[PDB]
Ligand SMILES: Nc1nc2c(ncn2[C@@H]2O[C@H](COP(=O)(O)OP(=O)(O)OP(=O)(O)O)[C@@H](O)[C@H]2O)c(=O)[nH]1
């Protein structure tokens with residue numbers, strides 16, 4: 001009946017992909033010279049948080065950044081001179097995410113209270129509270145000065161209107177908790193990796209799912225667009241990373257090693273898209289090669305689990321945070 | 332519920348797909364073209380490095 | 384130029400002065416996590432997204448968290464509570480015949496899952512076996528036998544170190560059988576890093592705050608003793 | 615004398631190596647910087663200064679049987695001896711009291727001990743040790759009165775130790791006797807608490823289911839066996855005339871000396887310290 005009808009389409013989808021596999025990415029990029037050896041050293045260390053850190057977002061100016069911690073603070077730093085600029089106290093001590101507006105006027109926050117809060121930096125006080133989700137917030141990203149996309153643990157995502165606090169549209173289709181999301185460079189599509197080991201490509205204007213990828217074997221923790229915008233990468237807690245192509249609609253390469261068994265908490269790309277930086281549970285960060293899947297560096301300056309990772313817009317520095325309440329700038 | 336899943340899969344089945352070779356070539360071309368302005372790949376002199 | 388350079392250093396000093404003052408309060412308070420089996424009556428104990436309460440006893444601050452806003456079967460948010468003093472687990476001991484596997488089996492499975500967790504590998508559990516009078520009445524009356532649902536209750540005998548307090552010989556056996564059923568799971572998995580503290584609780588009594596205080600004191604004392612290699 | 619120069623050369627290297635390693639590990643790593651590590655660092659610094667500026671000169675003076683640095687350097691060496699011995703024993707008392715406060719009263723321990731209070735305590739301990747050593751000795755209030763003492767003080771080639779009854783008694787009391795009883799009381803209380811906690815654990819889950827004695831035995835026995843006979847004969851040889859020889863005095867003094875080398879093995883047996891040492 002209906003159940004058997006869905007099975008027939010699944011075979012048709014799989015068959016169509018198999019006809020387009022002319023070759024593999026590893027074969028094509030065999031003749032290009034390797035990147036070599038990459039070594040990075042800590043330039044700055046930021047102190048002041050009383051507890052572990054989960055969130056961190058760079059500024060558009062590539063100089064200011066924000067961070068969140070369970071002690072209930074939202075501190076804005078100055079990476080150049082190492083000077084604290086702001087310190088916003090939160091009503092709820094369980095914060096799981098944070099974001100920084102493209103214009104630098106607002107900062108968002110959220111966590112186990114099922115609410116997203118917006119703060120007015122240039123006025124600091126709470127400006128808006130958004131409610132309606134039935135699960136803990138996992139991520140939030142600013143579309144523009146008046147729109148924001150959030151994902152929660154009720155297996156749904158939504159798009160908000162800060163002026164009136166109403167869900168413009170709702171995205172459904174996942175069967176597990178949504179763990180992360182990332183916006184396209186042009187801000188028309190975004191992807192979300194959930195706990196059902198699947199990632200979907202949504203349309204902001206229309207509000208419908210377009211493509212689905214089901215490569216991983218366990219919970220998906222991180223996701224990030226390629227700088228071009230035609231690909232993305234994910235990281236699960238089975239110590240594997242995969243690169244998916246939207247146009248070919250299939251996985252291209254896998255990044256794994258035989259000496260790693262810990263989970264992956266965060267991923268990010270480089271300015272040119274050649275390097276792939278991923279954070280792990282073994283207290284250190286690894287640097288991969290996107291075109292060859294070969295390790296090229298290790299960042300081993302942290303004494304606890306690494307929870308967040310980010311690269312500046314100009315590609316000048318990499319910031320990492322960990323559970324020992326310290327941030328570090330690597331260059 | 333069952334009807335909605337059937338309708339969704341039909342939409343995903345009718346998608347034009349290009350060869351893997353084309354996508355790999357495009358990615359390689361983009362990386363080769365933009366490898367010049369990658370401060371993390373080639374280290375920058377300390378004069379133009381704000382952190383050192 | 385140099386005018387703005389000194390301006391930033393003035394605001395940093397004010398912020399750093401506030402962080403030092405708030406650090407004293409953070410280190411002098413103890414955080415507790417409250418759980419439940421679904422119909423264990425954990426809200427009555429508290430009365431007598433997330434809900435939090437503040438209370439102090441003997442001039443010591445405590446802070447309790449109740450998570451009723453997340454109804455998911457799996458618990459992805461349980462890794463955030465890896466730096467709490469203790470976990471309070473409330474179970475209805477008078478639900479061995481309610482199919483709702485019965486409720487006691489589900490509670491035991493949840494306790495086993497919580498105990499054998501990668502992140503919660505150094506946190507003790509304070510266990511409240513609630514609804515004692517319902518269990519006593521149901522045991523004293525007929526038409527319900529524990530060995531029907533738990534066959535191991537037969538051939539089980541009351542331990543010698545028991546403190547029945549002016550009680551029926553029967554009721555006393557059932558309580559200790561359930562407590563040992565929990566302690567068997569508690570002891571095997573862990574070795575020296577965290578313990579379990581079972582209590583027999585009802586709705587009338589009001590000594591639960593003193594019990595929480597005493598188990599917290601014991602937890603911290605054992606932590607220090609083990610750290611100094613004296614235990 | 616050939617054998618003595620070899621064995622006594624190992625004591626110099628053992629003291630400096632162990633104490634330097636402890637100091638570098640604490641300073642280099644941010645995770646090893648706590649309140650107790652401040653006291654440990656103070657004790658390590660005292661032991662390092664002792665092993666750097668006491669053992670070599672004393673060894674040379676014993677081997678050559680003649681002091682070749684004048685009277686002023688002899689006085690300075692004696693002052694350093696007293697300062698470094700006094701300031702090392704008094705830190706063990708601080709560590710014992712810290713453990714006592716940590717275990718007996720666990721709720722108030724965080725408020726009681728802070729970085730500023732620890733710094734004040736360490737500075738006060740070092741000040742009190744300084745008043746005992748430099749102030750009386752440099753002002754010639756420790757000198758004896760017999761003819762032999764007068765001759766040895768007059769001669770510029772010999773540097774021997776002579777004191778009166780009051781100074782010997784007061785210095786011995788302040789350096790050794792109060793800390794001994796304080797730590798004995800503290801560790802008795804700690805052992806009692808550990809015993810009752812073990813009894814509670816056994817009563818709770820005995821059916822389903824020595825270290826304190828060994829640890830306390832090591833901690834008390836090393837210190838007592840190292841430092842008790844010397845501080846007994848320090849009073850015996852003044853109360854009783856012509857009863858204690860000089861060779862016995864020196865031997866007991868050196869037996870007390872080696873405790874500085876022994877300390878880092880006792881007070882740095884932690885997984886974090888072992889990891890820090892391995893990372894070096
Ligand atoms: N006799 C008795 N009844 C209890 C006891 N605890 C809970 N109850 C029952 O529980 C009812 C009140 O609800 P709560 O105890 O607050 O249960 P709850 O808030 O739903 O707790 P959860 O289901 O775990 O969320 C009362 O009408 C009682 O019948 C108890 O200790 N003794």
Ligand SMILES: CN[C@@H]1CCc2c(ccc(O)c2O)[C@H]1O
Nearest residue numbers: 695696699700775785786789867
């Ligand atoms: C030269 N050796 C000295 C002699 C007396 C003495 C010592 C140490 C502590 C004291 O309080 C003393 O009075 C010894 O180290």
